[PDB]
Structure 1
Amino acid sequence: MNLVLMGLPGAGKGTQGERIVEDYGIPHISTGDMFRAAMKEETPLGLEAKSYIDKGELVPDEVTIGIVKERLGKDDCERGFLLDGFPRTVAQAEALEEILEEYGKPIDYVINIEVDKDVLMERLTGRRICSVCGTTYHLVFNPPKTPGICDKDGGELYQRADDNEETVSKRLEVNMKQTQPLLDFYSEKGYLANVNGQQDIQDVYADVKDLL
């Protein structure tokens, strides 16, 4: 099961991805999560990406395509994987097509999680993420059982640095204007399937579960 989960910032890609990878036993590959892990370790990669991430802008395709190419080559991606947040530009999608062609692991489905921008904005200014596993929570829509700590490992929850109102605005704009070409690319390939992300976790996962 080779899957790509797309959708604007805050649509629930990570939330749905965790559930999918838990039920299918495949790697959850988030370019955003890989970047932040690189930032925490202070790797040369993290420093480079941080400049763009902090401003809400896209990290250059060269670097982004490069890390995904490497990652998708690992043995854990042999019988499936879930790409989250990649590709988010047509150039990345075309590069991905060739990369998977070479590995012999073409995309099965491209699920787009559709959510109104107003909803997106509220989901981002009330989000808290775990400092050890990256899972996310929402103070209103999906709060941690114990305020301030991750339900799973118990790590402290924090507000992502790029979740500040000003940056949330830039991110939404930056990504909205890239959707049309991406949706057109995948509708053309015939991998595209849309889902109404404006429901409760279970319903969205329910609408997703049926497909897979």
Structure 2
Amino acid sequence: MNLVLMGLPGAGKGTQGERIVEDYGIPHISTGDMFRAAMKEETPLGLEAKSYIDKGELVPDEVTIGIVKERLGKDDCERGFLLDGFPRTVAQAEALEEILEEYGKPIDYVINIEVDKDVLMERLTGRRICSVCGTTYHLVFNPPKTPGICDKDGGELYQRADDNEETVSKRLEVNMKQTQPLLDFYSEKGYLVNVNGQRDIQDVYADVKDLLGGLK
């Protein structure tokens, strides 16, 4: 299954993607994750991406499309994949079409995780992420057993650099304007699937599984 996860900042793409890959085995490919890994490793890509990411702006299309094209060519994508946070603009979506046509892996469906913008600031400010595995928690909505540490590996939890108030605000502004054009693009193709993400994590996933179970 060839899938795309889309949604506004903090809608729950990572949270749902974690459950998806466990059950279906396709690689979870998050451009955000890839950019942060690059920044952590201090590579040229990371340095270029940093200036945009830190302010909450989108990283330019060319490099972003470029790292995705490279990543999707890996052997672990032979049986499917789960893109997360890409495409996030119409131009990226049209570029992906070409890339997938060449790799012979056209998209099956695009899952849009719908969540009221007015509730995203809270999901992000309350977010705590594992410094070891990258899994996310929320001080109120999905807290760890032991505060400050990951349930899975005992790793230290921290706050993402771009989860501060001003940056979160910018990320919402920037992505909201890219949102309807992208939904229209995939709606026109007919494979956009909207899922209400303002529910218990397990209920959101239950809907996702009802779709994915028909794609094996």
Q: TM-score, normalised by structure 1?
A: 0.99
Tell me the residue number matched to 1:189: 189
Unpaired segments ≥5 residues, structure 2:
none
Deviations 1:37-64 (A, max 9, x none): 0011001111110100000000000110
Q: Detail structure 1 runs of 4+ shifted over 4 Å in the superposition.
A: none
Shift of 1:200: 0.6
| 3-state secondary structure, aligned to 1:209 | helix
| 3-state secondary structure, aligned to 2:97 | helix
Tell me the residue number matched to 2:3: 3
| 3-state secondary structure, aligned to 1:79 | coil
How many Å separate the matches in 2 of 1:122 and 1:185? 29
Tell me the residue number matched to 2:20: 20
| 3-state secondary structure, aligned to 1:112 | strand
Shift of 1:188: 1.1
| 3-state secondary structure, aligned to 1:8 | coil
Shift of 1:190: 1.1
| 3-state secondary structure, aligned to 2:59 | coil
Shift of 1:124: 0.5
Shift of 1:189: 1.1
How many Å separate the matches in 1 of 2:85 and 2:75? 21
How many Å separate the matches in 2 of 1:198 and 1:183? 18
Deviations 1:5-37 (A, max 9, x none): 000000000000000010001100000000000
How many Å separate the matches in 2 of 1:91 and 1:117? 23
CA-atom RMSD in angstroms: 0.6
Shift of 1:133: 1.5
Deviations 1:167-187 (A, max 9, x none): 100000100000111011101
Shift of 1:150: 1.3
Shift of 1:105: 0.2
Deviations 1:152-204 (A, max 9, x none): 12211100010001110000010000011101110111110000000010000
Number of residue pairs matched?
A: 212
How many Å separate the matches in 1 of 2:122 and 2:186? 28
How many Å separate the matches in 1 of 2:195 and 2:108? 16
Shift of 1:119: 1.4
Shift of 1:121: 1.1
How many Å separate the matches in 2 of 1:68 and 1:154? 31
Percent of paired sites with the same residue:
99
How many Å separate the matches in 2 of 1:21 and 1:106? 19
Tell me the residue number matched to 2:93: 93
Shift of 1:96: 0.2
